[PDB]
Amino acid sequence: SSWGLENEALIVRCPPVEWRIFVSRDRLKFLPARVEDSGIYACVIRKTGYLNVTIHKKPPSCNIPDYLMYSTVRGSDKNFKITCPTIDLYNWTAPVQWFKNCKALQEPRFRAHRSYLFIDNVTHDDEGDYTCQFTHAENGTNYIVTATRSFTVEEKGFSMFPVITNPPYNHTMEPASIACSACFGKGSHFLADVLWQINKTVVGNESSSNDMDCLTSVLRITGEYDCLALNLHGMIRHTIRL
Template sequence: MMAYVHLIFLSTFLSVSMTSETFDAMEGEALVIKCPRWSSSVKVTWYHMDTNEIIPAEEEGSQIFSSERFLWFLPTSREHSGNYTCVIHFSNNRTRSFNMSVQVHPYKQGICFPSRIRYPNDTGRGKIVCPTIDNYKNATIIQWYKDCKPLQGQRYFKGEKYIFINNPRKEDDGYYTCRFSYTHKGHVFNVSATRIFISKAKHSSLPPRILFPKDKDVIEVELGAALSLKCQARLGIKKQPMAVVTWDVDNIPVKYLRVSRFHEKTHSFEGREQDYYRETTLHISEIKKEDLQANFTCVAVNEMHNTRATVMLQLKSYREGRQ
């Protein structure tokens, strides 16, 4: 019955105007999200949209709890991914609701932050402020990283909440992660936040990273059907003087194959943070049996390095027959 009452209340709140915001966090870290600021006299109630239940104030052992306009996760777990709503109650009995979407990402070996957990360029003049640190009272920065490697050297001046790069150059462009600690009732929690830095230089290469396909992917096909294989890679910041994304078939570039069934089409674009991408699509007009024995490899190359991802084709009927 109580859940039903919560649902009625929440449905009433959802009838008023709302705005939405998305928060991404790493698993096992502290996270706090905030309801927009109004008068300190207003009451704020937090709801878990997926269960239609009120989120109470802190209790012994609770991982999620509300504290006025703040919703705390100490620490996050993947089960916390979901939708939350804060409802502001005004003295004239009117309310306003705000939706918050939380996505908790697991740690993966070799990746220090998911691509979605990053904040925009601060300035191009050398000062990089640690994002979100002001949300955590008395937080202490433990370590700065550049492109997932610990930041060291005399060119970096470390302030309380920022680092300053002396005479930034294009090789300083990249992703800077600050890792800091937050203490709550004697328990210490880590928080990490990543910000892209783009200097005033014309361009900067980063180690090429193929976003898709994944290496060793298996793609189901049908004989005689057409197929398009897409490969997308991030190659640096701003337009790159050397940027190649292409397909090989059994280690032979497609452009050197005398196979009329294969042809490539490439385009490039910049992301909202001036990341430079190239995407090449391998169009196969007709799948034949010999294609099932071939290795299709995407190759991404820039000034720094090259990387590869290989996929294979498999008949749909083969997989269904094994089940």
């Protein structure tokens, strides 16, 4: 599927190529795009593919509906950058113009660089639907292009290389119980696990003065022992013997 607004340029990619509407190398171009040509187009390589293109009438209201927006950007206070979708198919030049809820972003707070928009001092109040607009130049004629995606801002929290609090590095303990605890920072974690390894393979309530996010796996064998902590930063092992 592909979509675009009418009287705007539209250029599409299909997965020795054969297909007002032009074609250059392997790409199909609408300059300008008009609602009549919205259909299903076929591409051949000498082996084929199709996509359904839809051309739309410029939205009546400023709030654009969901079906002409691109994938949502789940941003944070640590990733306040929005990319302009599809822009590298066109022959475009800086600067790209940005809008939020149909209003021009003109500030030092909103910085445009290559295909990106950076929001300084980002806050939850900067959530909403952003429209990039740029120009595609072809044979002296400039055709305009816009794309829209929505953008949210969650307050992240940080992460660190895991730290095992117990058991200690070089220990030995004499119905048996040993707890493996680690802390990973404070925040939201994509992956964070603590586990026990018996002979280097996986086996198969009160806390310290820490604000950090800590996990504990208690190994109890009711009758080399490795304590492992891992996240995307890496994995650390403390080995215990008895």
